[PDB]
Amino acid sequence: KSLKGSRTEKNILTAFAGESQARNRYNYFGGQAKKDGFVQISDIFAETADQEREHAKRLFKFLEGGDLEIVAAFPAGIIADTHANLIASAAGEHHEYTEMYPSFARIAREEGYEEIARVFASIAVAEEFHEKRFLDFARNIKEGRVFLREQATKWRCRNCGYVHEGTGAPELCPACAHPKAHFELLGINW
Amino acid sequence: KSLKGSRTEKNILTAFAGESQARNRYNYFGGQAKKDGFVQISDIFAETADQEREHAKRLFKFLEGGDLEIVAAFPAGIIADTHANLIASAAGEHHEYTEMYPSFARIAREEGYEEIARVFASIAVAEEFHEKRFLDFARNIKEGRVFLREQATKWRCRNCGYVHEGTGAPELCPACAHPKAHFELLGINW
Ligand SMILES: [Fe+3]
Ligand SMILES: [Fe+3]
Ligand SMILES: [Fe+3]
Ligand SMILES: [Fe+3]
Ligand SMILES: [Fe+3]
Ligand SMILES: [Fe+3]
Secondary structure, eight states: OOOSSSHHHHHHHHHHHHHHHHHHHHHHHHHHHHHTTOHHHHHHHHHHHHHHHHHHHHHHTTOOSSEEEEEEEEEOOOOOOHHHHHHHHHHHHHHIIIIIHHHHHHHHHHTTOHHHHHHHHHHHHHHHHHHHHHHHHHHHHHHTOSSEEEEEEEEEETTTOOEEEEEEOOSBOTTTOOBGGGEEEOOOOO | OOOSSSHHHHHHHHHHHHHHHHHHHHHHHHHHHHHTTOHHHHHHHHHHHHHHHHHHHHHHTTOOSSEEEEEEEEEOOOOOOHHHHHHHHHHHHHHIIIIIHHHHHHHHHHTTOHHHHHHHHHHHHHHHHHHHHHHHHHHHHHHTOSSEEEEEEEEEETTTOOEEEEEEOOSBOTTTOOBGGGEEEOOOOO
């Protein structure tokens, strides 16, 4: 039915607003990650920013009216060092899939908007992987395993694609001469 | 002084939230412009989205705390045809420089935050050009002068840079074979 004048309508705008701020936060965090020497982590933040843009677009496409008042609490800033930024992000992601989305999906059902409850529940699934990914990176940093493993693996320079075998990523890539910050664990997903 | 517990603090988060949603709206509007056959207009929306990201970043950098509750009305959606999207954008831009920013700048002063009042007043200046730019494009569309003038001018294909002299942009660019949608009025600003 019509969305105008329902708790769900107000809920979609709230989700859109939080997702909108998250996209900006993740992009700023990506910038700081790059300046901290974590290029792979920098690009993940950027990718996540992009994915929130898409969660925001699906929700926005449901909206049909003019002005709508919202009451909501959002994190009042802070761009810190990368490890802290990763911890703050996971926490935000955590609240979305554990509290915000489940609740909004539940309400949309009570109100006869199953398709929107379907979308709200599906976004939460993606929000769970974002948190996990942020948590793993935070841990690697804290344990110092970002650029060095205990056993010998293959490392890839994201800048030129040079593959390196060893316990750790080299100081400078021998092909493109870009620094260690550009190396990641070689991955294959096909 | 400290920003915590001031009307200004709440005002910065509000500006950050609205700017955050504007960046997403302008990007969605850019997509629709591209699908409407207005590539120059599409890129302007994209550029504007990027500039709001930067207004949002300056404001965000002032924030120092945790969670903060906000009460505010935001436009509850709508991606329509390009002319309407341009009209809605100018209106939003209009409210920012005429009402929101002046007011927030005024309050920041009463509260001893001159530097923030300085930033708030400077953003409004940029918000005034965004509106004007959106208004001109809306008018050209409505009057049908997007791809055709009364006197003969020079038109440039944004895709390959081919310069065309005439009253109107050609159906297909002769160099890159991309359609009329890619042409703009040749401009020089140096
Ligand atoms: Fe999210
Ligand atoms: Fe997320
Ligand atoms: Fe390399
Ligand atoms: Fe703005
Ligand atoms: Fe603007
Ligand atoms: Fe061309």
